[PDB]
Amino acid sequence: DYFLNNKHVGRNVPYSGYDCDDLSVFEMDVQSLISREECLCHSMIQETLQVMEAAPGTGLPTVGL
Amino acid sequence: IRRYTDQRSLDRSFGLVGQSFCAALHQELREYYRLLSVLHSQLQLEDDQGVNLGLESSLTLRRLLVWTYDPKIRLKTLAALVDHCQGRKGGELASAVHAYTKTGDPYMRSLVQHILSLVSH
Amino acid sequence: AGRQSRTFLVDPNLDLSIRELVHRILPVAASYSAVTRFIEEKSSFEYGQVNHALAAAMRTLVKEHLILVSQLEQLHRQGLLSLQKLWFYIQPAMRTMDILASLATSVDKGECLGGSTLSLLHDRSFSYTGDSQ
Amino acid sequence: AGRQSRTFLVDPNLDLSIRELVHRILPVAASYSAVTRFIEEKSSFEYGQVNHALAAAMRTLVKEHLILVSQLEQLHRQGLLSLQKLWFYIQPAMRTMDILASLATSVDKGECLGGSTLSLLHDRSFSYTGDSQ
DSSP: OTTTSOTTOOSSOOOOOSOOHHHHHHHHHHHHHHHHHHHHHHHHHHHHHHHHTSOTTOSOSSTTO | OHHHHHHHHTOGGGHHHHHHHHHHHHHHHHHHHHHHHHHHHHHHHHHHHOSOOOSTTSOOHHHHHHHHHHHHHHHHHHHHHHHHHTTOOHHHHHHHHHHHHTOSOHHHHHHHHHHHHHHHO | OOSSOOOOOOOTTSOHHHHHHHHHHHHHHHHHHHHHHHHHHHTSGGGHHHHHHHHHHHHHHHHHHHHHHHHHHHHHHTTOOOHHHHHHHHHHHHHHHHHHHHHHHHHHHHTOOTHHHHHHHHHHHHHTTTOOO | OOSSOOOOOOOTTSOHHHHHHHHHHHHHHHHHHHHHHHHHHHTSGGGHHHHHHHHHHHHHHHHHHHHHHHHHHHHHHTTOOOHHHHHHHHHHHHHHHHHHHHHHHHHHHHTOOTHHHHHHHHHHHHHTTTOOO
């Protein structure tokens, strides 16, 4: 939420250092989101190829028809 | 900032209030240098580990810019405060600090409030 | 030149299709540059606390954008980033930056200050009633 | 020409045995083309929920047919596909497509709609009493 990570948006901001531990956490979270999208893409690709890669005449939904 | 601190650390005529302001500035500078050291240690860890770990610690120009975005704002605020307080002492220094307290930025507001309270104590 | 959107020169020897894709993406970078310019200009104390707060919020979103860009840079360092993947990943970012830039340009054109800025914010919030993000 | 099965021109200089095999296989492709045409036309929203659903099912079966064809194409690209192997693998597929096309043509001749279409489907289901597939 834009306001949740808004550490520097506040009325009573406590004096803090420059410590970016939360920033590193946010970076990791965004990286995880991107990696999750990439993994979903790769999995979809792999599944679609594996379906497309079945033996000729194999994998047909109407078995024997 | 460091030039200003060195210039004012030697002036006994700056008085106790001036020395206190310099002390607060030195404390903030120490915090900044600690943060910079941590970032340096992370980049050094990324270089020394030899692994292209896409961790936030890998020294990218972009990663450096990201990690220094907030530090850049902090340092800019501190430098502007130093410039505005240049030549002011005593109650004039206190007035200059109070004038910087009227900033709208909550992060700048927090920093200036902490510095003001510490120097006024 | 002036308060205009940033223009880009593309190498003439680039693929025409590549050039068109670049011209499609460049609006995001123009929005980023405009937002940064607005943040740096309206951040002066003279622009009032409301403008300061606007700049701070923009700074937070810019931080998010920079984080995204750095992660994309890491993926590129891995060689895993294609131009089509880049477009796909930037499309949401493109829309977010475009919305932010439109708001910035409206505030700048209106020279909105204090209560007028709050009114403009209310009207823009109603203007984005259909875009949940 | 009209509501006829698609006709094909084969190069006359082909082997007579090859030409006859082609003419034996071409009926399957004609049925496929007719079925695809019916599916694409009756897929309009104007066709009502029953005819639309029928077309959607036909489209799904056409997709399965395309998948099979792509695998056979791969075997040919792999050099693993002989003409007799293709004929053998398509013979059941040819019969399935021919049955589906005959049903489509019967529905089209009857202009069956709604309950009449459902009745026709029931009667066709009884018509396949001997064909378990």
